[PDB]
Amino acid sequence: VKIKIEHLTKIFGKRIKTALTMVEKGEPKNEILKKTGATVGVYDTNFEINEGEIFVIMGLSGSGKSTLLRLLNRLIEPTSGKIFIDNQDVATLNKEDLLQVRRKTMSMVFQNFGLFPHRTILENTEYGLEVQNVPKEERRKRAEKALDNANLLDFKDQYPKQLSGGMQQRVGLARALANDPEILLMDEAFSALDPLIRREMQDELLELQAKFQKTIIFVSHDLNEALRIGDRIAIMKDGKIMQIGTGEEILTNPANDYVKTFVEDTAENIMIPALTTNIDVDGPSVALKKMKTEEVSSLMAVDKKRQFRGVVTSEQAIAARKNNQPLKDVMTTDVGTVSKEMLVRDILPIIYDAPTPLAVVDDNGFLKGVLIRGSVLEALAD
Amino acid sequence: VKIKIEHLTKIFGKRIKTALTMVEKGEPKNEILKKTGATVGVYDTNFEINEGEIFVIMGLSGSGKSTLLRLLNRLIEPTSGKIFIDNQDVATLNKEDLLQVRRKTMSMVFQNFGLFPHRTILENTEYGLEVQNVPKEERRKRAEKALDNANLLDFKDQYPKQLSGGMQQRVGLARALANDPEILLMDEAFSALDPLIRREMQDELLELQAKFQKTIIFVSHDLNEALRIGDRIAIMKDGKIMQIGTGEEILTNPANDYVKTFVEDTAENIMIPALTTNIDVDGPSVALKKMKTEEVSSLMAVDKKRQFRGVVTSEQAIAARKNNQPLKDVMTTDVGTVSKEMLVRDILPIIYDAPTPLAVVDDNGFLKGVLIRGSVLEALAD
Amino acid sequence: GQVPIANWVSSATDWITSTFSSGFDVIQKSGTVLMNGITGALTAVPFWLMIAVVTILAILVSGKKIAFPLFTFIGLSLIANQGLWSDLMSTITLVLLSSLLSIIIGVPLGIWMAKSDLVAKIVQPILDFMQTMPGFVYLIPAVAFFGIGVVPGVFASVIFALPPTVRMTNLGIRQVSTELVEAADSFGSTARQKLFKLEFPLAKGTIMAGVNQTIMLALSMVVIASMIGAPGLGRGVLAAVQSADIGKGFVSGISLVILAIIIDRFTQKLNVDKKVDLVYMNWDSEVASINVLTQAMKEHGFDVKTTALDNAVAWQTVANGQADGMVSAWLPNTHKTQWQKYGKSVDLLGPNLKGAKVGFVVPSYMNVNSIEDLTNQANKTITGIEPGAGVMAASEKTLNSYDNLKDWKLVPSSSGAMTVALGEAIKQHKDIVITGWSPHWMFNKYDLKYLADPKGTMGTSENINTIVRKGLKKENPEAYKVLDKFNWTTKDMEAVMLDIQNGKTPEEAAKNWIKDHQKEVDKWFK
Amino acid sequence: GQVPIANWVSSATDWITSTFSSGFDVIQKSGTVLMNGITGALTAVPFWLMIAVVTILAILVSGKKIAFPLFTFIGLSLIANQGLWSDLMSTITLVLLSSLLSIIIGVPLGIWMAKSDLVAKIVQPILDFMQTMPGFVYLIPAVAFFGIGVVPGVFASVIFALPPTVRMTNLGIRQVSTELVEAADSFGSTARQKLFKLEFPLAKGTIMAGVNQTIMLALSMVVIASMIGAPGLGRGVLAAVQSADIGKGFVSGISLVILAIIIDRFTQKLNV
Numbered sequence A, B: 001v002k003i004k005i006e007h008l009t010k011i012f013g014k015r016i017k018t019a020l021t022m023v024e025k026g027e028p029k030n031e032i033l034k035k036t037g038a039t040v041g042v043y044d045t046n047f048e049i050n051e052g053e054i055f056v057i058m059g060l061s062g063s064g065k066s067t068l069l070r071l072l073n074r075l076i077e078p079t080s081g082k083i084f085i086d087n088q089d090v091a092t093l094n095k096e097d098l099l100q101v102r103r104k105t106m107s108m109v110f111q112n113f114g115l116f117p118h119r120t121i122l123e124n125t126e127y128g129l130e131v132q133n134v135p136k137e138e139r140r141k142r143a144e145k146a147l148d149n150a151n152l153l154d155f156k157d158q159y160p161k162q163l164s165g166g167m168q169q170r171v172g173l174a175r176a177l178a179n180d181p182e183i184l185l186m187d188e189a190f191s192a193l194d195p196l197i198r199r200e201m202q203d204e205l206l207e208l209q210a211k212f213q214k215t216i217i218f219v220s221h222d223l224n225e226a227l228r229i230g231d232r233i234a235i236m237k238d239g240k241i242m243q244i245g246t247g248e249e250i251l252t253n254p255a256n257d258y259v260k261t262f263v264e265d266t267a268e269n270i271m272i273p274a275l276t277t278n279i280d281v282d283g284p285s286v287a288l289k290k291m292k293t294e295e296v297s298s299l300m301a302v303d304k305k306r307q308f309r310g311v312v313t314s315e316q317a318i319a320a321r322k323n324n325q326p327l328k329d330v331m332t333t334d335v336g337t338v339s340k341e342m343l344v345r346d347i348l349p350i351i352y353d354a355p356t357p358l359a360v361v362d363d364n365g366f367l368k369g370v371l372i373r374g375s376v377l378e379a380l381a382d
Numbered sequence C: 001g002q003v004p005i006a007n008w009v010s011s012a013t014d015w016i017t018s019t020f021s022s023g024f025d026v027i028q029k030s031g032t033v034l035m036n037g038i039t040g041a042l043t044a045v046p047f048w049l050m051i052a053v054v055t056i057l058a059i060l061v062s063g064k065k066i067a068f069p070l071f072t073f074i075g076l077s078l079i080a081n082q083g084l085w086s087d088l089m090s091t092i093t094l095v096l097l098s099s100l101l102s103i104i105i106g107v108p109l110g111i112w113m114a115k116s117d118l119v120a121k122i123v124q125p126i127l128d129f130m131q132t133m134p135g136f137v138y139l140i141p142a143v144a145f146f147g148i149g150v151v152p153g154v155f156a157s158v159i160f161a162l163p164p165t166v167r168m169t170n171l172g173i174r175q176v177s178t179e180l181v182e183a184a185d186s187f188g189s190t191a192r193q194k195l196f197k198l199e200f201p202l203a204k205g206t207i208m209a210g211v212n213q214t215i216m217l218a219l220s221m222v223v224i225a226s227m228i229g230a231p232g233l234g235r236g237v238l239a240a241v242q243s244a245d246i247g248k249g250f251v252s253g254i255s256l257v258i259l260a261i262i263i264d265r266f267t268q269k270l271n272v273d274k275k276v277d278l279v280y281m282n283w284d285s286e287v288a289s290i291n292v293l294t295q296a297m298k299e300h301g302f303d304v305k306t307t308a309l310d311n312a313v314a315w316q317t318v319a320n321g322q323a324d325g326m327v328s329a330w331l332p333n334t335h336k337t338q339w340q341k342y343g344k345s346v347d348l349l350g351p352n353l354k355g356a357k358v359g360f361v362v363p364s365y366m367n368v369n370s371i372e373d374l375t376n377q378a379n380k381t382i383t384g385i386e387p388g389a390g391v392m393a394a395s396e397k398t399l400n401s402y403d404n405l406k407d408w409k410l411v412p413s414s415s416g417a418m419t420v421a422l423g424e425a426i427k428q429h430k431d432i433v434i435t436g437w438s439p440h441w442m443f444n445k446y447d448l449k450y451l452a453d454p455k456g457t458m459g460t461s462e463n464i465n466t467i468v469r470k471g472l473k474k475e476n477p478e479a480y481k482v483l484d485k486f487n488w489t490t491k492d493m494e495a496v497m498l499d500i501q502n503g504k505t506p507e508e509a510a511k512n513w514i515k516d517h518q519k520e521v522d523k524w525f526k
Numbered sequence D: 001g002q003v004p005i006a007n008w009v010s011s012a013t014d015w016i017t018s019t020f021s022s023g024f025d026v027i028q029k030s031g032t033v034l035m036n037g038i039t040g041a042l043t044a045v046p047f048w049l050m051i052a053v054v055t056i057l058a059i060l061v062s063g064k065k066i067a068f069p070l071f072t073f074i075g076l077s078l079i080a081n082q083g084l085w086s087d088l089m090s091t092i093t094l095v096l097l098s099s100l101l102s103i104i105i106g107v108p109l110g111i112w113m114a115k116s117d118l119v120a121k122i123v124q125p126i127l128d129f130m131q132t133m134p135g136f137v138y139l140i141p142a143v144a145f146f147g148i149g150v151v152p153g154v155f156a157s158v159i160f161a162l163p164p165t166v167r168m169t170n171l172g173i174r175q176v177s178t179e180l181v182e183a184a185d186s187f188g189s190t191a192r193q194k195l196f197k198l199e200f201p202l203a204k205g206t207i208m209a210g211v212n213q214t215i216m217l218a219l220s221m222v223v224i225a226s227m228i229g230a231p232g233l234g235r236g237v238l239a240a241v242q243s244a245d246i247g248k249g250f251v252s253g254i255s256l257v258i259l260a261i262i263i264d265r266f267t268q269k270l271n272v
Ligand SMILES: Nc1ncnc2c1ncn2[C@@H]1O[C@@H]2COP(=O)(O)O[C@H]3[C@@H](O)[C@H](n4cnc5c(N)ncnc54)O[C@@H]3COP(=O)(O)O[C@H]2[C@H]1O
Pocket: A272, A273, A274, A275, A295, A296, A297, A298, A299, A300, A355, A356, A357, A370, A372, A373, B272, B273, B274, B275, B295, B296, B297, B298, B299, B300, B355, B356, B357, B370, B372, B373
């Protein structure tokens, strides 16, 4: 165990001791607001955190989750509660000790990368030490070392504005790491990047955490972004609905009914956007390019007018290319075609024989989606 | 055929008649710049367009491709050339006739949606008619009709700022359509949306074009965004490298060598980002959630420390869930594991037996990617 | 060699004023009658009614906070308590004309600025040359064009308040995102349609900010123009300056602050017979005369208009024919160059006061008895009055007539600024030389003396006179008869001026003397 | 039912000026000697030398462009031709004293305003009450405190030019993105660290813009103060006004606008 929290809470607005007393009994937040006009972002939060335990904190815009982070670091002074780090509280600390705790243990990462545009990447990276009054060569050494750990040192002596989101995020994370912190707070760090770069950053972060065993108070509104990396989750709606974590207990034994809609636990509404190949104008090479970009091995083939026609496979396209023979001849018209919400489960047998999915073709020939062993999921939900 | 262009070109800067004369001989753009300081964005452009022929225009930032659009609509007065629409030139037109051509035939779509924030969606939608001096009930009728065609009429009497990119784009496209134009110019319309919404918009646009046979001068820097929809492509680097179009001829017989790097036509560098399941902390329900989000049927399973361990399948996870038995027991350790650039093609046989891919596991147990019938592509490139 | 810039400018202005004179005069008539009618209309409204109206509008504009309406009501009540209402209404009418004209002439100019790239290049230089130019200049040609009154205030405020409106308009129309303009073009929106549908409804914020700046500038420039016509609180603050009267200057400044805050706060919350026309010059000597003259002259049934301004302007005012007359013409030497310019364009009456003694002034305790017996006392300074005064013609010639003064400096001030500086010297008990004249009031409180002038250039046979425009005898004989007889005692005039300096109002002290000497006063009325 | 504002203000002014008289007198002596020395220094320099130096500075700050330095040389030559050089130097020294005093006492006040919301509430009203009063008033107490000369001119210019400096300082320190502020406070950076590493270098544009405004206001207030001591071209323009001699008035206004243009251009090129 590393952290331990007790009745931590934060009240905004004015005339708040009344609100503090109220939460000391258990009045809901909405009553407090309507009575005092003192909006509350956190409410009787109690939990604990261990070492190396990426502890995600999910929720919606308005749950007061980033506020919880900033309370851990005390950027926002807690209205009440305690935070036992290193057997040392944090809400009862003088300024200098809190300052050293910030410089040494904690470190922060932000949604929009929290970077100084009036500096070059290395200065931003070393700022955490620059403010600690240390000689400059070791500062620059650790900065270049961290950047080399992120494969962008050649991109130093440049300015953030001339970079892309991913490199700015890597720079912010390195600035955080330069300190050798025992903790890393994030406020939707990867939420501003592209989802591809988002996955890349998640994988890199997991790699790091495997190498570096340090706590991480992540924050995200994407449940995917939490299950991928999160070792213990905590969902927040103005308070801790449940944080049993371990990934499934949010899915297996959700205490509330709100979580079960937050994670979103019949008919063929499970169809997914399809990968299409308009044969009449495109051909084999285009189809193979589409497969490469789309990271698949087969495709669905339609008529120019968006009528479904059949299926295409990588080998079929290759044969077409070598033979110069075009599509609509080396093609798979025979397919287990399906309707929109009309073959829910009678399809169980047919889905097994055919490795390819079963396009949910509209009765008029149009196509909406496909089905790839997502049917086995809710066929057995019974 | 609808459009026909002749030696159209546009010269910026000053002292340009010299530049016009130069392009009349064939001097490169860079020489013109260094000699006169008159940067050129278009250079001796000649082509033609047909009806219903989505005519994409690819290129890089600096190719002067959006300038070509704005020249078609004459928002930027052409330095020279002609544009024969409806057997009527466009660069030799008085103001009123050009104005009517803009109101009736042409219509425009922009990257950042070109929406007036000081109006409500319906007013933006009807602006194209509002400026034509028509009575208001038919204006509102056509506006609501178009919005209903985009499934957001309930979102009228609201402001764009309180919407998301997709709905703003639909509104802009409807504003364009309200006019019943015979043409639709776009400047990287979908480039500001999410790629998911981008694909949805592409499919909707193709649906529309099937229903509505009207020309579309699309623009995009994504080759995917062109092959998906484009019926005839034209690549641009300060000039028309080649526009044979038809999708493959850019891929099959690329006249230049630049195109072959623009479209990007050995070792296992074809590996793709993998879909992972950290068994030691996550379990069956989490794995099935990942499959659902990731739109697949199987997954790769690793050790907490990012060592590869094996494979998991939807049925295996379902059995684990019903039986309550966890992963690392109902799992597929046996797999055709592979190294990073060391089994390029000897793997041809093994890839066939196994429906699942072959993880390119680092020799130390780490994982980088997988291989899904992308090997059949360049195994036969020989 | 030097270039005749001054001669060129004066020649061009003279050619204009001789060429477009009829247009200037008709504009003067129409504008003055218009502003006078508006002011009469506004002051016809009782103070309680308009104060309550404005507080109600404050409530309507903001109903949650009670700060602005409260400040408005309290301040306007305070003003009307101090007696500064009619002046306030004149100030508002000037400000409205100025702001409206500046807007009407700038916003179109901002349009023709943004829609053309040549006009920006032409005008922005002019805007920078207009936006740093001091206000004092703008009102020089105004008098040369329209002459004294409200018209100069309007013109100066226009020319001084136009720049920010024009600039912010051109900025706010040139800054709308190019996609919106490109769209409005792609849908075939004529310039008018996009201008009235896209440009303005988005630039209005910047345009209103520029209009707020225009209003501020017009207000300040009215305060400045007070020296010429420009009635209102500007006259009050100006007189408080030229007399060092801290209280009245503070009062007028606070009233202008109230007016300006009111207008500002509103703006940011609307973004989303027998008549006499006399002239005097704020000199404690001449304040006593006219004020007494008017209060008495009223009794016979004379309609009065006193206009406070500088000496040489008044001579021009009386000269060209823009006013009736004035009784503040020290002569034949202190204001002689004024006569050399516009002494020929009058019909002088005759003295009004015998014994106008001019000369330097020093504390009696100091040794020096004549200017020739002065070595290097008082840092070789001559603490004088406004540089446009008449004694400065003498003092300029004095320092350039004697040897010992060849290395002494003349430092202008106001006609009352030195008096407080003097009082500082006597309390500090330090040598100090000050330009001076008589009759005056400080002689009655301090122990001071003149300095004998062996050359006597700065004035020996000095005596106030009074002048009237030629032919006034054929256009207002009653005042011509009255003014001719206006000649009275030298000695206890000072009761008029000593009473005031002790803490009474000019009219109140001017009233008191007339009761004592009503018999002599009635002699003037004949 | 009138209320005696006049009497209260006069009594307060008399009491304050008769109470702190020694301090005002010593300040008068020091300021006048300092300003006369500065003016003698700046006018001792031959005018060709200073024109050439300043044109060199124009070329330095603007290398490719020739219009601005050409205008500088032409205007300053015109001034020196007409004889308004010593006046010009007196005006400059007044402007310098006023601007530096205003900056020195306002920028820290801007910091304090940005650091406490209470002080902003206290001051913004005072800034509104200060930038809205006409300049004419501000000097009346000046004479009452410092007397005829230049000291009152610079005091009034200070009081009339300090608002926009303070306002822009507070506004430009209060508008920095709270993300960077949270980054600074999260890596353990005291107020000094972030103030001298984060707040300033990002507020500098606003601060120097406000300090251009301050200079314009001080210059105008000097022109006004010319009615009391306050030498320079203000005296020339005032004499033109009091005589309607449009010649000298326009000449001095041309010279002042030339100076203001020079200063605006220079200040515009210390922030970019
Ligand atoms: N990037 C990745 N990382 C890790 N494992 C991956 C992976 N991509 C695919 N797999 C796994 O390997 C198998 C390869 O599928 P393939 O692409 O040959 O065959 C695919 C594809 O060719 C076709 N298909 C058509 N539209 C599709 C779509 N929208 N999404 C997925 N597959 C689609 O349907 C088949 C469904 O594949 P299924 O789920 O049976 O099985 C998939 C999946 O279990």
